[PDB]
Write a protein that binds this DNA or RNA. Structure first.
Ligand code: MG
Ligand code: MG
Ligand code: MG
Ligand code: MG
Ligand code: MG
Ligand code: MG
Ligand code: MG
Ligand code: MG
Ligand code: MG
Ligand code: MG
Lengths: 106, 55, 14, 117, 88
RNA sequence: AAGGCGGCCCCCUGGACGAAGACUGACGCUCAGGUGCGAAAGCGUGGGGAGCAAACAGGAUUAGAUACCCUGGUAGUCCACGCCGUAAACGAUGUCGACUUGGAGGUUGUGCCCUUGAGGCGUGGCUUCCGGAGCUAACGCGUUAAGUCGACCGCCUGGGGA
């Protein structure tokens, strides 16, 4: 089974809608035998360059261990939702559980 | 082993104009140099490092 | 050069 | 007639002509001067002294706004890159920011052919 | 080729024990299941001529290994050709 | 395998290489016809169109400018679906195996070591520049041979005609 690191950032005007999207996406993963390793909320964060005429983007970092059922639907509902402006997934080497350098300083 | 999240390592490996310093100047290993290149290209999409000194 | 090549076709005399 | 007190100099530098243009921080143009109409034509237009009076004559048309702190934006690989910055200090200004803003494509379009001579 | 559960089971299917993995009849079955795995891939990906080289390698590799068992002991040959669906 | 292949990310998928053993037992090498891939131009049908740009438009140059230079500009370059199968498709060296002094490095691993530092010591895979013996018409090659040999195949027989 694959090991994914899922990066998605939220539109800053809907920053209170973030914990709703945390637990709605999680219940579809864990029901189909999908594990979870890291769930870190960062709040607003300053951008290196502006994107979609905005500033101070909300950042949420994830690690999802799950089969290929979630990789079809979750990337489409990111493109279906207007809240997520950037979605990025990547395959990792192992199931990892380690705090980010953003949390270790903040 | 190397990762894109530790931006303090990535600040030591770029210029003021966002250009990637090659391994000739820093004297790093060639195994990490391909890995540091794609790690910046991950961070370049995630708006962590600027492309140029223009914006 | 190979003898086994000359089994298929000998050297063509002009 | 109007007060802005914040200058931005988008100066141009090509091989044939150098163009000095004063504007504000918000895109609204304030004045320009080209080396073609400055008494320099053709080979005389491609001289660094043509950029020495183009920056001064453009600066004399933007002192109506009372600009003291300006920004210098150098755009292009053309000659005269030094003669137009020293000429801004010769017009009585306080030089603050100098920034190369030369457009560099990431191999976007195909460049034209060679000029074999 | 495959995962660990698909590889180790077929070795236990046609081998006498878990150690019987280097024999020719196992090597036919490793190529038989792999070509059967790639039936739907090359139908959708006819412009992938580079992975077709890996496919034509394994077809040529299976043909050479069928020629060894046929020339030595035909009793084990007649078992495996119908047990995997060969000879068309 | 070669022509070649370069933003990032996912999915599918191919070979290469290394370590520890276990296991089949020559299952191999090579290849005329046959079979598939095969730069770009161009051809067929239907899309697509920034930039560049045959023919061509126009201006300089000039003896004339057809070319050069410059301002424009269609086919094409883009994608799907085929066909075309030729190149200075070159390492101008067909493939495989066995051996024969060596260095400067690069890339990629692995084994051990006051871990006493990303190091010390070994040891395979890949790759470039020097260079001994030897070979060579000379140039140069020289453990990746064009050195010494084997297995097999292609090809050449004065130049031009061609
Ligand atoms: Mg593999
Ligand atoms: Mg035995
Ligand atoms: Mg046509
Ligand atoms: Mg022309
Ligand atoms: Mg066409
Ligand atoms: Mg030819
Ligand atoms: Mg040569
Ligand atoms: Mg010598
Ligand atoms: Mg040599
Ligand atoms: Mg003749």
């Amino acid at each position: 089974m694959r090991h994914y690191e899922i990066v998605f950032m939220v539109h800053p005007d809907q920053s209170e809608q973030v914990p709703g999207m945390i637990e709605r996406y999680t219940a579809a993963i864990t029901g189909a035998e999908g594990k979870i390793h890291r769930l870190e909320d960062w709040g607003r964060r300053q951008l290196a360059y502006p994107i979609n005429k905005l500033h101070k983007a909300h950042y949420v970092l994830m690690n999802v261990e799950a089969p290929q059922e979630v990789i079809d639907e979750l990337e489409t509902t990111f493109r279906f939702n207007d809240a997520v402006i950037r979605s990025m997934v990547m395959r990792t080497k192992h199931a990892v559980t380690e705090a980010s350098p953003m949390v270790k300083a903040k | 082993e190397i990762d894109y999240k530790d931006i303090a390592t990535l600040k030591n490996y770029i210029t003021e104009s966002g250009k990637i310093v090659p391994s000739r100047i820093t004297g790093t290993r060639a195994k990490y140099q391909r890995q540091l290149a794609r790690a910046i290209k991950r961070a370049r999409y995630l708006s962590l490092l600027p492309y140029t000194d223009r914006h | 050069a190979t003898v086994n090549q000359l089994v298929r076709k000998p050297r063509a005399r002009k | 007639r109007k007060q802005v007190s914040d200058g931005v100099a988008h100066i141009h530098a090509s091989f044939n002509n150098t163009i000095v243009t004063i504007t504000d921080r918000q895109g609204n143009a304030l004045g320009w001067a080209t080396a073609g109409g400055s008494g320099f034509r053709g080979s005389r237009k491609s001289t660094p002294f043509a950029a020495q009076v183009a920056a001064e004559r453009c600066a004399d048309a933007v002192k109506e706004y009372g600009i003291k702190n300006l920004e210098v934006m150098v755009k292009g690989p053309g000659p005269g890159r030094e003669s137009t910055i020293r000429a801004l200090n010769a017009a009585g200004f306080r030089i603050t920011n100098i920034t190369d803003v030369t457009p560099i494509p990431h191999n976007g379009c195909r460049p034209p052919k060679k000029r074999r001579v | 080729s495959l995962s660990t559960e698909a590889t180790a089971k077929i070795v236990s299917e046609f081998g006498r024990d878990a150690n019987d993995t280097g024999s020719t009849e196992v090597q036919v079955a490793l190529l038989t299941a792999q070509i059967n795995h790639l039936q739907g891939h090359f139908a959708e990906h006819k412009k992938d001529h580079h992975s077709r080289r890996g496919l034509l390698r394994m077809v040529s590799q299976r043909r050479k290994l069928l020629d060894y068992l046929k020339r030595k002991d035909v009793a084990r040959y007649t078992q495996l050709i119908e047990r995997l669906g060969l000879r068309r």
